[PDB]
Amino acid sequence: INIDRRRKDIIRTININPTNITITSIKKTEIDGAFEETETEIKCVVRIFNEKTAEKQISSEKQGTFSSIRTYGMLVSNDVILEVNSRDSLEFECIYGRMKIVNIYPQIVKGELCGYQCSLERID
Amino acid sequence: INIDRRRKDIIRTININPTNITITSIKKTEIDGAFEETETEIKCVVRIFNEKTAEKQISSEKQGTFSSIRTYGMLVSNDVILEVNSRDSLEFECIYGRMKIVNIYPQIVKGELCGYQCSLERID
Amino acid sequence: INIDRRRKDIIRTININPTNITITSIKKTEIDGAFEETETEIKCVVRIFNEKTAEKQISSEKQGTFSSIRTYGMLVSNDVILEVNSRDSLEFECIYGRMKIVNIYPQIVKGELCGYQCSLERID
Amino acid sequence: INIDRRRKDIIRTININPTNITITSIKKTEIDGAFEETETEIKCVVRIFNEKTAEKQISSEKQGTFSSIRTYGMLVSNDVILEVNSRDSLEFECIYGRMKIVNIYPQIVKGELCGYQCSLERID
Amino acid sequence: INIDRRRKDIIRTININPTNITITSIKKTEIDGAFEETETEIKCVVRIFNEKTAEKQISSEKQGTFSSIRTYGMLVSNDVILEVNSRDSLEFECIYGRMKIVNIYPQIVKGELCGYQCSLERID
Amino acid sequence: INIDRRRKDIIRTININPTNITITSIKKTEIDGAFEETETEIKCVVRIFNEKTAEKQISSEKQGTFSSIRTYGMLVSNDVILEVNSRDSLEFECIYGRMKIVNIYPQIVKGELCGYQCSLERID
Amino acid sequence: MRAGIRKALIDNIKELKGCYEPNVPNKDTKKPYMVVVQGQDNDHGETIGFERSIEVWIYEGRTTFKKLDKLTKQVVEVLDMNTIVDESENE
Amino acid sequence: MRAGIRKALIDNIKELKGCYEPNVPNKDTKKPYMVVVQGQDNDHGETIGFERSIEVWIYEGRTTFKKLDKLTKQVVEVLDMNTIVDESENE
């Protein structure tokens, strides 16, 4: 497979049903054995799609209540480098509850990045 | 895929076997660190179908007893905007036990809503 | 699909291998914060079939011992209205251990009942 | 499906690879709130076959140790009526650890028995 | 199916990719309510193959640490009679970590043995 | 299958999308009932691919926090003899979080090594 | 009191690579590292008042436990009954 | 104190194959082997000071428990109240 084929396919698939998304990144930085969080905001064009037939979990407790579902995937181009770790997070404001990028699958051809297959978690 | 194609397909599929449904929405509003619940009632045309071969769970305890099953899905048009969260609920009474909308899948084409795929829980 | 097609198919399928069944219904009625049970007995023509490759569970304890399996389904016509809840039960005496109707799937066409798909639990 | 077809098929399938088996039945009888066990021995022609790719469990404890696997099925004709409950057991001495009949599936055509599909547990 | 067909197929399949294997059998014998272990060493020609996509478990504790995986199967001819129980074990020194025979599936045709389908656990 | 066929296929598949990788091996050696670790570094040409649709686990505790996922496989030639045990580890720094070789599948033809199928864990 | 104990452990111990908070250190953190976990505060009578309990969890690279025992003796020497000043609180 | 107990057990016992630390011995380790696990250190008053608790977990090849009982009596004979010198600490 050639890089141009993958690039054209990713861009086309995103452009069938794109949505403009405002990713917000909170990166934790180790300072004196604790975290100092620097918040940055980055925008990208994105297509969102179902990937898993999952069920909405609920986690009510004395801290609070929130329900999250794992169904939605995501597919974004090469325009911005992404990364999600324990110390790094990415979220964005979809209208139907806030989305959160759980795991990133970087699509690479011959050691060259071309786009991120990605997974989400719709936090209600 | 064109928006009109999706709209025609959803409306046709609902009209093969529609049921008039009286959705009741109880939305929890944060007031002085507690919930004040406002109850509204909204009606929509709906088709109900099986989606998962699941088993009826039972949850008897000193609080009480109730049995629920996740088999039934749901498919509704664009006529009314829906939303289900931890603080927001939607229910309706099919004659065979009360139904409850667990999770909402909004079918969107080019950033435009056209209908909600949905999942239910038949609370006996 | 037309209602007559579904009715013909259900009646045919039951008639390939029917079994006369004596359903016994124990309905719990709330009286002074407790249950008063009224036992009624109803008869229907029924076909029994396998649906799930499950394993026989055993639940021995100081209360007693019994083993149950979820393999058998059931398929019954429109002749009698059924319902199973936490407060309502349905059982019948198959020769090879007691059968118990766990969950009911009412096959409905255009808001009109035509027959119940059903699941059983063979209580040994 | 006609009864003769099912009978011919069951007998043929057993006769492709039959094994003579000495079923031993221990039936527990309630006597003064306890069990009195009557042991009977019955013989049948049987074909044994794999049905489930299961894993051998082990249950070592201060009572003792034994390992059982759920893989093997069984298929027997109409010649003898079988039954397995909590209070009733069936075992037989296969060379590679004695088998044990876990669950019985009676193949019935038009309310008439023709043969038992059956499941085993090879107790090592 | 004829016995010669099965024998030819097993011998061919082993001969596509055979490995000479030094099975070591430790059989526990009950003596005064305890086990006296007699160690025997037996050699057979064997083909090893993957059968299950399973994850490597780890079981570290104060007794020690070892990681085992259930992926590999095994296929051996009729040349030697095998048996694995709670009181009987079989292992062999494959150079890529110790292998242990978990469960034995004896392939039998008309009550005559022809070869053992077998499963392994590669202990590291 | 001939050895040259397997060798050609492995080398071709690696060369469709190779990545140069710096494997670091920490082998624990038993010394006075404790481990002395000798660190060596070995380089190989490798292709990385998805194998399992798995979800990212998180293991936050008072020791620290880290999240890992089992999705990525790996495929490497015969150039270097790998091995992984409880006492032996292999890791390498893919730019999207450090990878770790969980389990090794040595592809062997007629008792001759030709390449390792392999599974990874992307430790974030 | 986390700042004071962390500063004391970092300053007076040189084998140490870092002294973090409970769920801070990533899997790539360089061992040996310590973690300071505060416990209950309980009213232990008039003479003592409220008594806080603090734990210092040492970690090591699974070479051998003798290194960890040496580190533990070092930590006990550093913190046992030695007055420590928390610069953040200035207490 | 691990080194001292391990050395004493290895020297004064000959049925023993090895005396390891908690999670060391692989599955192919030759039984019988022992494992020395240290426990709490608790302040047990003025006269005793801090009292460490140490365990010696014997292991055997599942032949019979009489062999393990003999080994246990041997371990108790070796370690009970006999002064042991830890060469690593020189204490």
Strands E98-109 and E112-123: antiparallel
Q: Residue D123 in contact with residue D101, Cβ under 8 Å? A: no
**Resolution of this structure in Å:** 3.4
Instruction: Please tell me the distance from the alpha carbon of residue H20 to that of residue C53, in angstroms, as a whole number.
Output: 48
First to last CA, chain B: 40
Token output for G32: 């040996």
Cα–Cα separations (whole angstroms), residue A49 to A5, B4, B104, B106 = 21, 20, 14, 11
Contact G59 F63 (CB under 8 A): yes
The strand pair at C67-69 and A88-92 is best described as unpaired
A103 → closest Cβ in F19, F56, F60: F56
Convert F56-79 to b/e letters by CB count within 10 Å (16 or more is b).
Answer: beeeeeebbbbbbbbbbbbbbbbe
Q: Residue B120's CB: how many other CB atoms inside 10 A?
A: 25
Q: Do chains B and H touch (3 or more CB pairs under 8 A)?
A: no
CB F67 within 8 A of CB A28: no
Distance from CA of E34 to the nearest CA of F (A): 30
The residue type at G45:
G
Taking CB atoms and an 8 Å limit, are A19 and B102 in contact across chains? no
d(CA C45, CA C49): 14
Chain A CB contacts of B106 under 8 Å are 96
Comparing CA positions, the residue from F37, F68, F38, F71 lying closest to residue F52 is F71
CA E107/CA E117 separation, integer angstroms: 6
Task: Tell if the CB–CB gap between F85 and E96 is shorter than 8 Å.
Answer: no
Residues with Cβ within 8 Å of F39's Cβ and at least 6 positions away in sequence, in order, are F24, F25, F26
How many residue contacts between A and B have a Cβ separation below 8 Å?
33
Q: d(Cα F52, Cα F73) in Å, to the nearest integer?
A: 8
| Residue D36, C-beta contacts closer than 8 angstroms, at least 6 positions apart | D28, D29
Can you point out the beta strands (E) in chain C?
19-31, 34-47, 57-58, 67-69, 73-77, 88-93, 98-109, 112-123
Q: Where are the alpha helices (DSSP H) in E2-107?
A: 3-16
Return the structure tokens found at H22.
Answer: 């908690």
Residues of C contacting chain D (CB within 8 angstroms)? 16-19, 50, 53, 55-56, 58, 60, 65-67, 69, 71, 96-97, 124
**Contact status of H26 with chain E (Cβ, < 8 Å):** yes
Experimental method: cryo-EM
All residues of chain D having their beta carbon less than 8 Å from the beta carbon of residue E86 are: 58, 60, 65-67, 124
- Contact at CB, G21 and A34, closer than 8 angstroms: yes
Task: Provide the Cα torsion C39, C41, C47, C50; round to 10°.
Answer: 20
Q: Which of B68, B86, B113, B119 to mutate to test the interface with A (most CBs of A within 10 A)?
A: B86
CB contact under 8 A, A86 and G24: no
Tell me how far apart the alpha carbons of residues C115 and C106 are, in angstroms, rounded to a whole number: 6
Best probe of the A interface among B68, B103, B114, B121, by most A CBs < 10 A, is B103
Angstroms from G88 CA to nearest CA on chain A: 12
Smallest Cα distance from E18 to chain D, Å: 24
The answer to whether the beta carbons of residues G82 and G13 sit under 8 Å apart is no
Cross-chain CB nearest to C106 (options B17, B56, B96) = B96
Is the pair E, G in contact (3+ CB pairs within 8 Å)? Answer: no
Kindly report the number of other CB atoms within 10 A of residue B87's CB atom.
Answer: 16
Residues of G in contact with F98 (CB under 8 A): 27-28
Does residue B9 sit in helix, strand or coil? helix
Nearest to H27 by CA among D68, F80, E89: E89
H helices, E strands: number in chain A? 1, 8
Contacts of D110 in chain C (CB under 8 A): 17-18
Token pair, residue D17, equals: 């690879």
Q: Cβ E60–H23 below 8 Å, yes or no?
A: yes
Question: In this complex, do H19 and F33 lie within 8 Å of one another by their Cβ atoms?
Answer: yes
Residue in chain F closest to E14 (alpha carbons) equals F110
CB contact under 8 Å between E124 and F70, yes or no, is no
Amino acid at E11: I
